[model samples]
Target: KTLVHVASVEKGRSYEDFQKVYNAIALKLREDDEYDNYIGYGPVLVRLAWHTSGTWDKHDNTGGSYGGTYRFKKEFNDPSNAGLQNGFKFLEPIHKEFPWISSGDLFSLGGVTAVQEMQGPKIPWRCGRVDTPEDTTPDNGRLPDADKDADYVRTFFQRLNMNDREVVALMGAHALGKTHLKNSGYEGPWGAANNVFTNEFYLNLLNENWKLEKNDANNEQWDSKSGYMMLPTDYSLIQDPKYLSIVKEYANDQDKFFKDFSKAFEKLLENGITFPKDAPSPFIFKTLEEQGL
Candidate 1:
């Protein structure tokens, strides 16, 4: 077994070092060119990492990346996990290449890499989470459902140790991708560039004229001229007076959104697990461009 390296992180490790790790992850991503019209599954894999970690509740130790149960058929069939297989398959090669890292570390770090590579944020990650067996898999239905309302949204996040602000900020990530009818029983992109990273999800919430309509899949969502769709809970961000300003703020400053998002996303993956500061600095994974074809 490898030593559990915990403690304070050593200083002086610059962004460039982490960039190399990002490059490695991104490099492998390009090698596996499948899914989403060959747009690559790296971004979605990053989102999967976020969603998996997002299930952690500080109050209880029910869900987390510790188990790596997503590998199991039971977890794969999870309703909340419909589209995430794209992410799991994407990471298989990375795991094979760097077999030493833990799934917890890999999944969490995958999100960080995707954000940075996608021009979203620089998330710091450490390696320590050891993979467990199938029995460690979390019970299904732990992740939040999209059909829920504001109150449901509020309550569900608390299970993951998220405050309203963090929830609002994370929802902004919707700007990066679209909901597929086959994947989530919903349809359409949330922004102009569904495959790229940005805070545009929040912008679309405030700027566009959306019609509340039920899609052919029979789900009620906000439809926009841009061909984007927003779950009712997503629209609740602006409908509720409290979350609107944050929505507006992120929409305005991409930098601020990137900063706040990095923090929250990292914390989401951390799952309230306190590491010694001296622990290894987060590894930065690169994108396909950083590596020459």
Candidate 2:
């Protein structure tokens, strides 16, 4: 039997409703400033969005953002999702406030809100992801491994249908948060300003003199004397010629990176779901600063 998940917006919910949810998330982000050394919950929220969606397998269409199964113990307990509980906890109250919103939409939109609030880019979001049952949850180990090389990175993303450019653009998110040793066996921020989104990940990859060293967790990661770090997978962007070209492009042009990342991230979150011909157009949310809130 073939099953197709269709986009179904929550009853009576429209742009304004989702915007309120976004505003609540943004405000809480501002109010709760002590998380992870004041880097806040933005990055982990983005990671939550990505990890929730990243499980999709194009061949079987078994996993994707369509099923908000991360709420289940299996997905939540997956080792790959170690640090995302922080993001889920951050959204708990918002989810409570907006009871009509589906888990998948809330998770994906949280990422969009965090990105825009952090001055990253305008990621157009569509709301209509209906949560599936726990049994629908994808098996663990679908997420990328940080210790892999360029060939591994390239081949791994192919399952998700991301090309070299999209892969490089998505990796730019490394600029947002640091890895925790307790969580991923990796440590350190990828750039100077961990909360703000920028092209610094690429810049540091290109500009810094890096040395490969084993962390206290005994995992090998690239470290710069300036105190930033890159997972082997992150550094692979520069190691592969095709990926390196896109990485260089993003490093030199901020606007292009933003535009490309906006599209790529949206596609990432929307994978494995079908939208009908008459589905509502994607919404572009205004930043809280833009609304003077």
Number of the top lDDT candidate = 2
lDDT of 2 by residue, 225-250 (tens): 99999999999999989999999999
Model 2: per-residue Cα lDDT at residue 109: 94
Q: 117-138, model 1: which lDDT tens digit per residue?
A: 6667767666556566787677
Worst 10 residues of 2 by lDDT: 1-10
Cα RMSD for candidate 2?
1.0
TM-score, every prediction: 0.87, 0.99
Q: After superposition, how far is residue 65 of candidate 1 from its true place, in Å?
A: 2.1
Question: Model 2 — TM-score against the truth?
Answer: 0.99
